[PDB]
Amino acid sequence: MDIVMTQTPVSLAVTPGQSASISCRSSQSLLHGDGRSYLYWYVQRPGQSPQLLMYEASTRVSGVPDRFTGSGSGTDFTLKISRVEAEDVGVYYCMQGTHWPGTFGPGTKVDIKRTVAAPSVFIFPPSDEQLKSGTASVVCLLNNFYPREAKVQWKVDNALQSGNSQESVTEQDSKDSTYSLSSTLTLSKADYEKHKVYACEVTHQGLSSPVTKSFNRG
Ligand SMILES: [Cl-]
Ligand SMILES: [K+]
């Protein structure tokens, strides 16, 4: 009947050394016949493979520091990190393996808190060498911003473009705790020459109004 997995809080910004505490709830009980609650924690990180931290609700994966502690049974489980470091930064997920099929929560963003930083926006036309290949990749860059939440909107001749776009954000910088992001609009050479002005529109909490960076192709 597919157990619904809920997670709270939605987001968590923390001071290096301060403790964190993530909770996870299941729509039905995950207690198994052998007395074990089959629910495991893992953290997602950009450009990395997911790291398993806790399993069987309370048992710690070998190699994970003692800062991590698993708690709960039945329908309520909590993960606690006593001294959050920069390497602990990521989006934390709980997943139940008791009932088929497996199900996981929405996740909780955990990163180091810093002051709000508005992104520096730069747009780049495709190279003449790549257009010689028949492909055009327009790139919009968002540099050193916090928090992660940001929206990139591509516009072609002031018309909204949504297709043929890829987004890629870095990990939280271990030093200044900012993020950097790149969005690439990849078009055919023929489609690329059907428009005059290319622009990306960026929305971020630190900006009063959306910032648009444009260019015109020759
Ligand atoms: Cl498990
Ligand atoms: K910046």
Q: What's 47's domain CATH number?
A: 2.60.40.10
Specify whether the CB–CB gap between 19 and 81 falls below 8 A.
yes
- Single residue among 112, 140, 155 that ends a domain in this structure: 112
Tokens of 22: 């993530």
| Closest ligand to residue 120's CA | 2
Please give the distance, rounded to the nearest whole angstrom, from the Cα atom of residue 171 to the centre of ligand 1: 27
| Closest ligand to residue 36's CA | 1
| Closest ligand to residue 150's CA | 2
* Residues near ligand 1 ion, CB 5 Å cutoff: 38, 40, 55
Specify whether the CB–CB gap between 83 and 20 falls below 8 A.
no
Q: What are phi and psi of 49, to 5 degrees?
A: -80, 145
Question: Are 86 and 137 members of one domain?
Answer: no
Please give the distance, rounded to the nearest whole angstrom, from the Cα atom of residue 93 to the centre of ligand 1: 13
**Cα four-point dihedral sign 32, 34, 35, 39:** negative
- Single residue among 69, 95, 112 that ends a domain in this structure: 112
Please give the distance, rounded to the nearest whole angstrom, from the Cα atom of residue 174 to the centre of ligand 2: 16
DSSP 141: E
Cβ-count burial of 173 within 10 angstroms (0-12 exposed, 13-18 middle, 19+ buried)? middle
* Residues near ligand 2 ion, CB 5 Å cutoff: 120, 144
Cis peptide bond upstream of 46, omega within 30? no
Question: Are 212 and 146 members of one domain?
Answer: yes
Alpha helices in 97-185 (DSSP H): 128-132
What H or E segment, with its residue span, contains residue 190? helix 189-192
Tell me if residue 87 falls in helix, strand or coil.
helix
Count of domains observed in the chain: 2
Label the pairing between strands 150-156 and 197-204.
Answer: antiparallel
| Closest ligand to residue 56's CA | 1
Method: X-ray
User: What distance in Å separates the CA atoms of residue 141 and residue 117, rounded to the nearest whole number?
Assistant: 15
Range of the domain at 142: 120-216
Which strands form 135-145's sheet, in the order they lie side by side?
120-124, 135-145, 179-188, 165-169
Label the pairing between strands 179-188 and 165-169.
Answer: antiparallel
User: What distance in Å separates the CA atoms of residue 149 and residue 86, rounded to the nearest whole number?
Assistant: 19
Where are any strands of DSSP class E within the chain? Answer: 5-8, 11-14, 20-26, 39-44, 51-55, 59-60, 68-73, 76-81, 90-96, 103-104, 108-112, 120-124, 135-145, 150-156, 159-161, 165-169, 179-188, 197-204, 211-216
Q: What is the DSSP string of 44-61?
A: E-TTS--EEEEETTTEEP
Question: Are 68 and 87 members of one domain?
Answer: yes
Please give the distance, rounded to the nearest whole angstrom, from the Cα atom of residue 94 to the centre of ligand 1: 10
Please give the distance, rounded to the nearest whole angstrom, from the Cα atom of residue 143 to the centre of ligand 2: 5
Nearest to 168 by CA among 192, 150, 147, 187: 150
CA atoms within 13 A on the CB side of 21: 3
Residue in the structure block whose two tokens are 């990749």: 137
Question: Are 67 and 161 members of one domain?
Answer: no
Residue in the structure block whose two tokens are 């705790």: 177
